[PDB]
Subunit: 410 residues, 4 copies
């Protein structure tokens, strides 16, 4: 019997050819990932139909021979920034994928700031699951962190120098229950540039506004104190920081503060992991043990093409709970420019150490079926992009990000 | 969680508005029928996507306020001729539905004979399940029984008087396995009219051609002998007869000869059931017991609107096996112009007598959910159209046909 | 040879059935109007393709039997608020039409404020004519007068009582040169309600902001003085006022302040026409002569259905020039609930008095061909909606608005 | 102002991505050709909308990187076999284009013979211009010359060895009046192969059938006599012959018999031009003078890549008139594998000799704008495919065929 993506691509009508190309590229990947996780055929159908109706129409142009049609400049290759499978204890695995919503004419004089794509995506997604998307947090943070179209157009000279004029990124957690949780990431770089204000200060002022406007405890003291220090700024690129929240009931949602850091040593990794020792506990220690393990497993190996390793690029988030003052970190090792073989082997060794044999097989299956380049090309550099590490009191929490449009790069 | 047809209508893109209207009308019905049978959500998705891609684009215009857009004249209301659920022993239930493939411009000077709709439908269906549709029998019988476009256009004056210029009807058995078996019905009335030849003779000459060209035993002696008799012609409308075959491997397919008969008594029913006593056996006797039961259960009641019952309209088929000389009948009681309440009650009493309680509940559920008019309007005349009765050696075989576009008539 | 709308509807593919229905209704009307004006076939093709790509996808649902699908509440019937032909001296005639951009799911929990429709329309329109749409004025006035989605959702309780939650209306002047000038109307009623601020004050503060931010003289002293008076408020509904500007180069654009007034006498008409005598000159006098002529020609006749005339509903604008302190009025007689025969006859008598015989014939032709109900039904109340009167130094300036979806009401 | 194809591609919605790609390739070419001829913008719009609705959906897959999606094998590159501009005396120029209608799944088990594409194209074309397409001749010749799907499938083993299983080709004359005359070409090679019958005999038996069935004089004596001779068969490939007729009123239509011949000398050219001297007159002499001129102008030059010229590939038709016994020839010099520069220069010298300066400029303009490769690449071999020469009593009749998808080959 045909797999859901085969049959769907055979039947589905596509409003645009770019949607058909994006489907051909991604539906195999997303469906193979869901199927290896264990999603049910009806759930695969629902989620692939979501990807067809809400998402792909908001992926933007499909890159051609020379990528002449990609008018929306970005460091990331066109398409989903990632397609990830989270792995937790108890054979828990959830498929999720992130997209920067891009319009068909973003970057051009008609949509120079790509304002409508994310809103269209959210509208479609709420129409497909009425009641699943709550815009309370989005409605509070969109004026504070994001720059609407009119503002960006009036204040263009202030942001025209910026290469990636990103203002809102959307991730869709794709639950085994066919429910899609929308997550919104706001990089306020445009906001800071227009207002000429510290990133830290505007982000945390927005969080505090939401605190007082909602009555929810989002403890941001430690994060602000650490991120304001000068030592942190030596390594921490704050121009690359962004805020995230789940588009749910604020009492059931979260606030996460992300930032980028190019560090050289594990002590700087701990600087970003524990907020200068401010955060403490057994979970911090265990998570950093796992982080050091994967550090010396991945960044120990030689870089492709005999290029020396200047420094280890990492991202980091700190997750604030609405119920409690808890701040919990999640470290993201960037492995885009590394051997997919070494990344895969490090993941496998980590899972094997954690006793996650089923996750080992799921990961190998997803790599083999959805990412054939990894085995076909020993020198592959286009599948994995990030390895997230966290240790919740449930246990380890490791997500493995992958470029779902690696077929385009190979 | 939404039902497959809700979600699909929310996501699916439709090439034409008529397809959207037909979907709104039928997908509820077809999906409720499949779901009450027990089809799996993935199977419902696949079958509704088939109905979206292959079928509905070949249903023709959707009837408007005044049915001004129905340029393809037909006795049947626009849409599927039926949407049926077969009921056999052992809680066996299969959903199937019949369509006369109509084009968007059938009946107009561009498609005055509606030649391409059925071929397009078969092409799409084979593209969606390559290897499921075998055209051996279709390729043999299409020149013999059906009239292509060029012929009909050259020989128009011979057939212009005909009201329903039907030449090929397509039924889709919708298996629980997501496989759709295509069945083709050929009314050669146009063929006979152009060639000025007996219906009986051309149909059975085609069957005999196929016999000698295939080496398969399709015993048509008894059927021909009975249908040639003059007594039969007093009741039997032969202008309304047609041939059917399953579009499968001829060694795994069948040949069925249908005809219409307006009879008054059960002895004429037996005339058509047993081919003037030529067919015999316990199955014939039991099947006719069931037929007489439903005869005196349905045609005993008074007709709606105090209109007297002139005669009992029936159809009948005789099924020839490729493996054996067997001829087996299937009698179709026409109950389109009768109280849907009385038809439903007769079905329920029949099933209860057969011990088919589960089928009783399935039938009541399908009526309540997919056909609300039956309970809302005591004087309903727009749900049921046919009751097929047969007795295979497996046991009783009762199909219950229903106008799936009854929402349009009420 | 077929007319452009016939052929186009025959060839064009429509993304949705509602677009096909809207086309069937409006393309005849718009095309007949353009053709009676004298637009060239290529211009008709271009403008109807604009109406197909940019507009109709932003008209919203097509009203069904019971208008159950119109989830966006509005006093106006669904569709274009008007389809107008302006008539000036020298046989100058320009086709234009106004639309309140509505989304497919406006009024529902997904788009409770209809935020994206107007922006999508402008985006498409700029993509179709890059460089024709300038958003300087839109970018300045959108935050001041319009309420974005997040704000409206946070401040819902303040505006939930409002029936027509309109915030931006788009008119497309459809030039004989195939160029479409976009005009944006901002009713800040939601803005005033959320901020609990005077309509007059916020509108004119926005205008003054634009003055100081642009260096363009938009004299709003007389308008503000008149509209602030208490006598004016006795007749003037200020809850119904709105601002308009042409989406062009601000030095080549305009600012117009509209308001609604239910007056009884011609002295109140002059109150609104001359801003309490503040505006003066020969043009004012001549324009008011024409206004009184049409007043006593139209509002003199009896209302349909023997309903007595409580008061004469009028709208009024005052047009400020970027080049000069000029304020010029345009009075809009509302004739929606009046005999289309009497309105047509008044228009004809006016044109005949002005010597506009060619416009008389153009108007009669448009009425006969695009609005057959006017002749078919003597008691017609569904074609004309407004009669605008102005007297520029060029000469008289009379626009005649018509419900282009009158086919739906009759 | 944008050109019709620019604006149309900006607005039009495309049912499939292949249609969008084909549009991007061809609409520029077709529109530039029409515009250089002098077609009016409304006519360009109508004809490009025809190419969008009827044709491109019946061009088949768009060739990808490796032409893996071209499942319908053919000697010709995918797309229109040609896009031609006929040039006659008096600055008379018409654009016409030929297409072999291919389905989206032609060559696959679903449409192994590509049966529905041509019929769909004719249906759409008649729907767009009801009364323009007359199927009398098509209805007579389709059973005689063409092989339907069922026959080809039953008789597959007889034709499976054939590489190009072509059975019907459609050309659209695109008149300056926006009317599209459909022309159907029937290569009966499949018919002859299945029936194992001479091409000559079946073609001319069909023509004679039509004669007796219509009362129209189609003199085929000379053509049959010549084509039956053995000397002709030494050069004449009869496996490559085909019949053509205009899909109009038979009394206003024509019958043309085409064949392919690989000849070496001008005396063989005259053999095919005059039917072994059977045809005579001043027109024959003048036409052959022009043919010899272009022979020694084009085939005199060296072949690209230093490949020696084995023989001169030509096609030839003989046009029979329904009104008269006239047989008139049209010789087609095949110049696909020759320098587009030399072909263009020969065309220019010919036109200059004929006094057709305006045609010279039209041809150079079409080459420069629609075929930039000719000037950009001196060694171009992908623009011109045929040069037709005829001499009607009106005067010379020279058509210049060009691969409209040359952008794909370069
Ligand atoms: C796109 C960037 C401007 C910005 N920075 C990131 O690296 C990022 C990636 C990401 C991966 N999964 C979720 N978000 N998110 C952002 O918002
Ligand atoms: C449509 C008629 C011309 C013709 N006669 C019928 O009554 C018929 C109905 C049917 C119901 N289920 C399957 N076939 N089939 C036919 O071919
Ligand atoms: C409530 C709104 C519809 C608001 N009110 C109006 O009467 C109006 C109509 C209109 C006709 N032509 C142009 N505008 N414009 C608006 O913005
Ligand atoms: C496609 C071939 C099977 C066959 N042979 C040809 O060369 C031909 C080309 C053509 C150019 N313009 C019109 N016809 N036509 C045919 O039917
Ligand atoms: C890997 C990057 C840069 C972003 C991470 S977002 P996430 O997807 O890690 O969020 P969760 O906390 O896993 O929901
Ligand atoms: C009820 C009518 C008129 C047609 C019957 S066809 P069928 O659907 O009975 O065929 P099967 O023998 O059930 O496959
Ligand atoms: C008739 C109503 C209510 C609105 C008028 S807008 P307009 O269309 O009169 O604008 P112009 O000044 O004619 O451009
Ligand atoms: C040259 C190719 C091979 C076929 C020629 S068809 P045609 O376009 O020349 O037909 P006309 O006689 O020009 O109508």
């Amino acid at each position: 019997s045909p797999s859901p993506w085969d049959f769907l691509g055979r039947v589905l009508q596509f409003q645009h050819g770019d949607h058909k190309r994006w489907w051909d590229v991604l539906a195999p990947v997303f469906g193979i990932s869901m199927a290896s996780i264990g999603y049910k055929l009806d759930v695969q159908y629902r989620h692939l139909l979501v990807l067809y109706d809400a998402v792909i129409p908001n992926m933007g142009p499909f890159p051609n021979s020379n990528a002449s049609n990609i008018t929306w400049t970005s460091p990331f290759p066109p398409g989903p920034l990632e397609a990830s499978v989270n792995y937790q204890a108890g054979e828990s695995s959830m498929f999720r994928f992130t997209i920067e919503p891009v319009g068909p004419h973003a970057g051009t004089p008609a949509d120079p700031v790509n304002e409508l794509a994310a809103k269209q995506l959210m509208q479609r997604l709420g129409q497909l699951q009425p009641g699943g998307v709550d815009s309370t947090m989005f409605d509070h943070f969109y004026p504070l962190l994001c720059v609407d179209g009119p503002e960006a157009r009036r204040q263009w000279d202030s942001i025209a120098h910026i290469y990636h004029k990103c203002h809102t990124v959307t991730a869709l957690d794709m639950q085994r229950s066919a429910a899609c949780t929308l997550k919104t990431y706001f990089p306020p770089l445009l906001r800071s540039t227009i207002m000429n204000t510290s990133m830290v200060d505007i982000m945390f002022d927005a969080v505090e506004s939401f605190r007082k406007q909602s009555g929810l405890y989002f403890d941001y003291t430690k994060i602000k104190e650490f991120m304001s220090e000068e030592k942190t700024h030596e390594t921490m690129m704050v121009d690359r920081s962004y805020l995230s929240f789940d588009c749910l009931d604020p009492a059931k949602s979260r606030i996460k503060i992300y930032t980028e850091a190019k560090v050289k040593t594990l002590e700087e990794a701990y600087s970003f992991w524990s907020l200068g020792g401010r955060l403490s506990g057994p979970e911090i220690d265990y998570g950093f043990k796992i982080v050091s393990q994967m550090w010396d497993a991945i960044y120990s190996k030689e870089l492709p093409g005999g290029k020396q390793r200047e420094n280890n690029h990492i991202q980091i988030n700190w997750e604030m709970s609405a119920k409690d003052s808890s701040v919990a970190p999640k470290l993201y090792l960037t492995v885009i420019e590394d051997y997919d073989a070494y990344v895969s082997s490090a993941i496998v060794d980590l899972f094997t150490g954690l006793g996650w044999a089923a996750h080992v097989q799921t990961h190998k299956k997803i790599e083999k079926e959805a990412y054939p380049m990894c085995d076909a090309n020993p020198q592959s550099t286009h599948a994995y992009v990030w390895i997230s590490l966290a240790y919740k009191k449930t246990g380890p929490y490791i997500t493995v990000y992958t470029n779902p449009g690696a077929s385009i790069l190979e």
